[PDB]
Design an enzyme around this catalytic site. Structure first.
Site, PDB file in Angstrom:
ATOM      1  N   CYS B 108       0.818  -1.209   0.000  1.00 42.81           N
ATOM      2  CA  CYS B 108       0.000   0.000   0.000  1.00 42.81           C
ATOM      3  C   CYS B 108       0.853   1.260   0.000  1.00 42.81           C
ATOM      4  O   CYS B 108       1.611   1.521   0.954  1.00 42.81           O
ATOM      5  CB  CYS B 108      -0.919   0.034   1.222  1.00 42.81           C
ATOM      6  N   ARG B 111       0.419   4.653   2.768  1.00 47.80           N
ATOM      7  CA  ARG B 111       0.677   4.551   4.201  1.00 47.80           C
ATOM      8  C   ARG B 111       1.119   5.837   4.919  1.00 47.80           C
ATOM      9  O   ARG B 111       1.214   5.844   6.143  1.00 47.80           O
ATOM     10  CB  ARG B 111       1.623   3.379   4.509  1.00 47.80           C
ATOM     11  N   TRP B 280      -8.753   6.291  -0.456  1.00 55.60           N
ATOM     12  CA  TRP B 280      -9.147   6.943  -1.700  1.00 55.60           C
ATOM     13  C   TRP B 280      -8.252   6.421  -2.825  1.00 55.60           C
ATOM     14  O   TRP B 280      -7.177   5.864  -2.573  1.00 55.60           O
ATOM     15  CB  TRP B 280      -9.099   8.470  -1.602  1.00 55.60           C
ATOM     16  N   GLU B 285      -4.722   3.308 -10.485  1.00 54.23           N
ATOM     17  CA  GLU B 285      -5.590   2.161 -10.192  1.00 54.23           C
ATOM     18  C   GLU B 285      -6.752   2.121 -11.224  1.00 54.23           C
ATOM     19  O   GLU B 285      -7.005   1.091 -11.861  1.00 54.23           O
ATOM     20  CB  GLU B 285      -6.152   2.223  -8.740  1.00 54.23           C
TER      21      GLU B 285
HETATM   22  C1  HEM Z   1      -5.864   6.663   2.103  1.00 52.96           C
HETATM   23  C2  HEM Z   1      -5.478   6.496   0.823  1.00 52.96           C
HETATM   24  C3  HEM Z   1      -4.921   5.148   0.298  1.00 52.96           C
HETATM   25  C4  HEM Z   1      -4.277   4.997  -0.863  1.00 52.96           C
HETATM   26  C5  HEM Z   1      -3.932   6.096  -1.881  1.00 52.96           C
HETATM   27  C6  HEM Z   1      -3.922   3.597  -1.012  1.00 52.96           C
HETATM   28  C7  HEM Z   1      -3.241   3.091  -2.082  1.00 52.96           C
HETATM   29  C8  HEM Z   1      -3.063   1.765  -2.324  1.00 52.96           C
HETATM   30  C9  HEM Z   1      -2.690   1.203  -3.599  1.00 52.96           C
HETATM   31  C10 HEM Z   1      -2.441   2.028  -4.871  1.00 52.96           C
HETATM   32  C11 HEM Z   1      -2.599  -0.124  -3.444  1.00 52.96           C
HETATM   33  C12 HEM Z   1      -2.247  -1.161  -4.529  1.00 52.96           C
HETATM   34  C13 HEM Z   1      -3.488  -2.032  -4.740  1.00 52.96           C
HETATM   35  C14 HEM Z   1      -3.550  -2.617  -6.130  1.00 52.96           C
HETATM   36  O1  HEM Z   1      -2.826  -2.099  -7.019  1.00 52.96           O
HETATM   37  O2  HEM Z   1      -4.329  -3.590  -6.345  1.00 52.96           O
HETATM   38  C15 HEM Z   1      -2.923  -0.435  -2.055  1.00 52.96           C
HETATM   39  C16 HEM Z   1      -2.941  -1.689  -1.481  1.00 52.96           C
HETATM   40  C17 HEM Z   1      -3.283  -1.968  -0.181  1.00 52.96           C
HETATM   41  N1  HEM Z   1      -3.756  -1.050   0.761  1.00 52.96           N
HETATM   42 FE1  HEM Z   1      -3.976   0.939   0.471  1.00 52.96          FE
HETATM   43  N2  HEM Z   1      -4.362   2.890   0.094  1.00 52.96           N
HETATM   44  C18 HEM Z   1      -4.995   3.822   0.930  1.00 52.96           C
HETATM   45  C19 HEM Z   1      -5.627   3.502   2.119  1.00 52.96           C
HETATM   46  C20 HEM Z   1      -5.595   2.272   2.745  1.00 52.96           C
HETATM   47  C21 HEM Z   1      -6.218   1.883   4.015  1.00 52.96           C
HETATM   48  C22 HEM Z   1      -7.133   2.775   4.899  1.00 52.96           C
HETATM   49  C23 HEM Z   1      -5.888   0.597   4.257  1.00 52.96           C
HETATM   50  C24 HEM Z   1      -6.235  -0.333   5.455  1.00 52.96           C
HETATM   51  C25 HEM Z   1      -6.470   0.105   6.703  1.00 52.96           C
HETATM   52  C26 HEM Z   1      -5.024   0.160   3.180  1.00 52.96           C
HETATM   53  C27 HEM Z   1      -4.465  -1.088   3.104  1.00 52.96           C
HETATM   54  C28 HEM Z   1      -3.996  -1.693   1.966  1.00 52.96           C
HETATM   55  C29 HEM Z   1      -3.679  -3.105   1.845  1.00 52.96           C
HETATM   56  C30 HEM Z   1      -3.796  -4.211   2.917  1.00 52.96           C
HETATM   57  C31 HEM Z   1      -3.212  -3.286   0.414  1.00 52.96           C
HETATM   58  C32 HEM Z   1      -2.773  -4.607  -0.249  1.00 52.96           C
HETATM   59  C33 HEM Z   1      -3.949  -5.004  -1.144  1.00 52.96           C
HETATM   60  C34 HEM Z   1      -3.731  -6.317  -1.841  1.00 52.96           C
HETATM   61  O3  HEM Z   1      -2.652  -6.940  -1.651  1.00 52.96           O
HETATM   62  O4  HEM Z   1      -4.646  -6.743  -2.591  1.00 52.96           O
HETATM   63  N3  HEM Z   1      -4.870   1.198   2.278  1.00 52.96           N
HETATM   64  N4  HEM Z   1      -3.181   0.748  -1.395  1.00 52.96           N
HETATM   65  F1  LIG Z   2      -7.193 -13.330  -7.637  1.00 51.11           F
HETATM   66  C1  LIG Z   2      -6.486 -12.414  -6.944  1.00 51.11           C
HETATM   67  C2  LIG Z   2      -5.602 -12.840  -5.962  1.00 51.11           C
HETATM   68  C3  LIG Z   2      -4.857 -11.923  -5.234  1.00 51.11           C
HETATM   69  C4  LIG Z   2      -5.008 -10.564  -5.498  1.00 51.11           C
HETATM   70  C5  LIG Z   2      -5.892 -10.126  -6.484  1.00 51.11           C
HETATM   71  C6  LIG Z   2      -6.039  -8.679  -6.755  1.00 51.11           C
HETATM   72  C7  LIG Z   2      -4.746  -7.980  -6.375  1.00 51.11           C
HETATM   73  C8  LIG Z   2      -5.939  -7.929  -5.426  1.00 51.11           C
HETATM   74  C9  LIG Z   2      -6.573  -6.539  -5.459  1.00 51.11           C
HETATM   75  N1  LIG Z   2      -5.816  -5.675  -4.533  1.00 51.11           N
HETATM   76  C10 LIG Z   2      -6.653  -4.630  -3.915  1.00 51.11           C
HETATM   77  C11 LIG Z   2      -7.179  -3.695  -4.978  1.00 51.11           C
HETATM   78  C12 LIG Z   2      -7.879  -2.550  -4.297  1.00 51.11           C
HETATM   79  C13 LIG Z   2      -9.152  -2.185  -4.747  1.00 51.11           C
HETATM   80  C14 LIG Z   2      -9.805  -1.135  -4.120  1.00 51.11           C
HETATM   81  N2  LIG Z   2      -9.205  -0.512  -3.099  1.00 51.11           N
HETATM   82  C15 LIG Z   2      -7.971  -0.877  -2.668  1.00 51.11           C
HETATM   83  N3  LIG Z   2      -7.436  -0.185  -1.653  1.00 51.11           N
HETATM   84  C16 LIG Z   2      -8.166   0.651  -0.906  1.00 51.11           C
HETATM   85  C17 LIG Z   2      -7.243   1.183  -0.026  1.00 51.11           C
HETATM   86  N4  LIG Z   2      -6.024   0.653  -0.317  1.00 51.11           N
HETATM   87  C18 LIG Z   2      -6.137  -0.215  -1.353  1.00 51.11           C
HETATM   88  N5  LIG Z   2      -7.297  -1.896  -3.256  1.00 51.11           N
HETATM   89  C19 LIG Z   2      -6.633 -11.053  -7.212  1.00 51.11           C
END
Ligand code: HEM
Ligand SMILES: Fc1cccc([C@@H]2C[C@H]2CNCCc2ccnc(-n3ccnc3)n2)c1
Ligand code: HEM
Ligand SMILES: Fc1cccc([C@@H]2C[C@H]2CNCCc2ccnc(-n3ccnc3)n2)c1
Ligand SMILES: C[C@H](O)[C@H](O)[C@H]1CNc2nc(N)[nH]c(=O)c2N1
Ligand SMILES: C[C@H](O)[C@H](O)[C@H]1CNc2nc(N)[nH]c(=O)c2N1
Ligand SMILES: [Zn+2]
EC number: 1.14.13.39
Lengths: 403, 404
Positions: B108, B111, B280, B285
């Site tokens: 993420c 952070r 957000w 994305e």
């Molecule tokens: C506040 C603005 C935030 C932004 C701009 C942001 C941005 C991102 C982005 C760009 C990714 C990559 C996901 C992808 O490409 O599929 C990501 C992943 C992730 N974010 Fe955030 N995030 C935000 C907030 C949060 C919050 C509030 C949480 C949890 C409390 C969080 C937890 C995570 C986690 C656990 C992943 C890994 C998702 C995965 O492996 O599928 N993020 N974030």
């Molecule tokens: F089949 C699968 C097995 C592992 C992961 C997968 C796609 C990467 C996981 C999507 N990752 C989160 C994408 C996402 C979407 C909307 N919001 C957030 N989000 C919001 C705040 N931070 C991240 N992330 C498919």
């Protein structure tokens, strides 16, 4: 044991079994992955590396267990036992160089791996002879813009004797002159090598694109300076297909991408000077060389000529200028009939290579962070392709700077 | 010198060492033999040690390590596990843990915001209907009419001899994907399976490219129930381009709230199977991945044709040109609509500030380079040039199998 590798665009799955053939540790551990890092932090060993390589070689020519295979192992063993080392036959050398390219996880051009011209320069005794060999390499590889992959191999390292070395990191490199205003004129990546050349008696220019001389070093001797004949160094002026002002920027780049500071390891033998060259993938020039902040850094200039809004990141001015610069490089090279491959064409061919290698060897070592191009990552197929990284031998390796 | 990973920034020439990784209690997928870091998906005594470790983290964060209250809480937790097989987090422990899980998430890039997270406690939830109410509240609060606020809602933990709370949808808001008769897909191909699941559970499907999916919500040991989100709660943004006037006629749109709903939140050995969180969007994305991936909406060719680019040769860079304008359109439309969004330049810059903060605060920061570097203009952002160490710290968010 065997990693499961998935393509997320196509849903297809492979299993890498080749990785089992790795005899060398990378930097990762179960506790932490260090894959994004650029650099790494007796006679029975050599003999085992030698027998293994010789086994590869005879296997490749469909002659395993044959008498010549058996006899060749005995030679290697006889030589190591008596002298602590041995020497490769030319055909073995040719095989080993091709395998090392094949095994290079960071190279996107590996579909070409079976087509490598190998120059044996192991009968070199002086810097002057290295210069001659290098000049012929450049002439051959450049071939009036119709680039051909090549490697020239200098004498192997030997115990308690200085290495043959090329001090430059590439055969062709632009000088970087540290001005007194703290700034850098030319290519900042090359400030140090530029300074070493000056110290060793080079008369510098004052351009942004001054081609450097080579500092060639024969064992335990001071390096020697050699100016490359300017007619050997093919260059491409940069202009843009629709933006007329672009050519005014005075931008240009060299045709020949030749790495000259990496170590070639074959069957336990080490070749400390073994410069190789292929042809540029356009992003190396358009994105990294011209737009990196710590390189020529031209993004803001081009952006302004395009009359873009520099004030905010959200106008995507950087992305816009970067695309035009890459388009300029491709256009220019095509107009000058100099071989070049765009990042889309390159990554598509690399996917074909992964498939070819999957059938041939059961896998293919790849460094995802290097294979994915520096712009338009997910727009290319390799972005969506999982990859396993590991070290196979023969290999290209980094080595310390000779100074 | 130091016996820890040396990390370098190649733009600035600066060096740090990661000591934080020493605190990692879980092995990732890599070995000295091979790096698997590009891979997307690669007993009371155990619980107690995880619990003790979390409780120590909590008392450290409030500067009361070694205190009487620290040692009593340890004895309180061990007693609970001794008699029930499990234990229960205090409220402020849950808040701390949720924030630390986000802080710890290597993938993420957002952070920098980790300390500002609204934690809704929903550990009293006892029905699928109640889950829906809590989710609607979350959406309302988090969306805030476009002024988006980070939030997470935490539902009851996995309990021994009892089925999980699960949200079947991967996000709170996602578009339907309808498999066609010719083999194509209308809508989002990512969501074909969940779409078919909603139908099997009695949803009357639409047939647009952008039908908001209903939620399939599963309370313990019950079949999932279906809930349609009232459309006024789901904020959307129609996409237009600031100069290309035809782009608006494409009829593309996206939703404001990016809310992950299928991930497991692990704190001190306790496992929260339903703990949706939302932030957000970073604009790539939507503009690059969701809209231009070949296996998603795949609109690159359509836009390039409208732009009159040469789609017959790679070297015209038509894909790159089209991708830029789509991303610009995304940014432009969200800003016009007053909906929070961050571009990949601002995001990556802020993440670098975050790395520096964490270097001082914890001696490093686990980060997944392949996920942190944006899918367009990679080396134009500062994170490309930043080496990164990846490792699993806990509390953590983890993937979990689809409940079907
Ligand atoms: C506040 C603005 C935030 C932004 C701009 C942001 C941005 C991102 C982005 C760009 C990714 C990559 C996901 C992808 O490409 O599929 C990501 C992943 C992730 N974010 Fe955030 N995030 C935000 C907030 C949060 C919050 C509030 C949480 C949890 C409390 C969080 C937890 C995570 C986690 C656990 C992943 C890994 C998702 C995965 O492996 O599928 N993020 N974030
Ligand atoms: F089949 C699968 C097995 C592992 C992961 C997968 C796609 C990467 C996981 C999507 N990752 C989160 C994408 C996402 C979407 C909307 N919001 C957030 N989000 C919001 C705040 N931070 C991240 N992330 C498919
Ligand atoms: C024929 C056309 C070729 C193309 C298009 C190509 C492409 C590339 C590119 C884009 C890189 C990344 C370099 C960087 O970004 O710094 C690379 C790395 C590399 N290539 Fe090639 N290459 C070609 C030929 C060759 C040949 C002939 C050899 C050796 C015989 C070779 C061996 C390597 C090695 C060892 C690396 C890693 C370099 C490093 O770690 O600094 N390549 N290649
Ligand atoms: F200080 C440093 C320590 C390690 C690597 C570094 C930069 C990455 C190495 C450059 N890597 C190769 C660049 C290059 C240049 C020209 N041609 C090729 N090339 C030719 C064929 N295949 C690649 N490669 C700096
Ligand atoms: C820190 C990071 O690994 C570094 O910037 C890498 C990323 N990927 C790369 N990819 C290529 N092709 N060439 C490079 O020099 C790099 N540098
Ligand atoms: C194969 C590769 O790991 C995969 O496509 C990854 C690459 N990097 C990513 N980065 C982000 N932010 N999100 C992703 O889904 C992915 N996918
Ligand atoms: Zn790794």
């Amino acid at each position: 044991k065997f990693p499961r590798v998935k393509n997320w665009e196509l849903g297809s799955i492979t299993y890498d079994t080749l990785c089992a053939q790795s005899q060398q540790d990378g930097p990762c551990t179960p506790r932490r992955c260090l894959g994004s890092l650029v650099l790494p932090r007796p006679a029975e060993q050599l003999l085992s590396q030698a027998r293994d390589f010789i086994n590869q070689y005879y296997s490749s020519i469909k002659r395993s267990g044959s008498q010549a295979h058996e006899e060749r192992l005995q030679e290697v063993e006889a030589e190591v036992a008596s002298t602590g080392t041995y020497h490769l036959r030319e055909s073995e050398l040719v095989f080993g160089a091709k395998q090392a390219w094949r095994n290079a996880p960071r190279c996107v051009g590996r579909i070409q791996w079976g087509k490598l011209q190998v120059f044996d320069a192991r009968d070199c005794s002086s810097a002057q002879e290295m210069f001659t060999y290098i000049c012929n390499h450049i002439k051959y590889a450049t071939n009036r813009g119709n680039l051909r992959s090549a490697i020239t191999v200098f004498p192997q390292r030997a115990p308690g004797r200085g290495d043959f070395r090329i001090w430059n990191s590439q055969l062709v490199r632009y000088a970087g002159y540290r001005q007194q205003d703290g700034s850098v004129r030319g290519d900042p990546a090359n400030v140090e090598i530029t300074e070493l050349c000056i110290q060793h008696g080079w008369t510098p220019g004052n351009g942004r694109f001054d081609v450097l001389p080579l500092l060639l070093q024969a064992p335990d001797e001071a390096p020697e300076l050699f100016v490359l004949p300017p007619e050997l160094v093919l260059e491409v002026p940069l202009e843009h297909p629709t933006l007329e002002w672009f050519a005014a920027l005075g931008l240009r780049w060299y045709a020949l991408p030749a790495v000259s500071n990496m170590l070639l390891e074959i069957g336990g033998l080490e070749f400390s000077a073994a410069p190789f060259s292929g042809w540029y993938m356009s992003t190396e020039i358009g994105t990294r060389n011209l737009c990196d902040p710590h390189r020529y850094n031209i993004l803001e200039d081009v952006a302004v000529c395009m009359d873009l809004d520099t004030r905010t990141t959200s106008s995507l001015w950087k992305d816009k200028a970067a695309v035009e610069i890459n388009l300029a490089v491709l256009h220019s090279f095509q107009l000058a009939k100099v071989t070049i491959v765009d990042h889309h064409a390159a990554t598509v061919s690399f996917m074909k290579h992964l498939d070819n290698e999957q059938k041939a060897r059961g896998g293919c070592p790849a460094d995802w962070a290097w294979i994915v191009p520096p712009i338009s990552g997910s727009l290319t197929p390799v972005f969506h392709q999982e990859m396993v990284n590991y070290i196979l031998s023969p290999a290209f390796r980094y080595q310390p700077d000779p100074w």
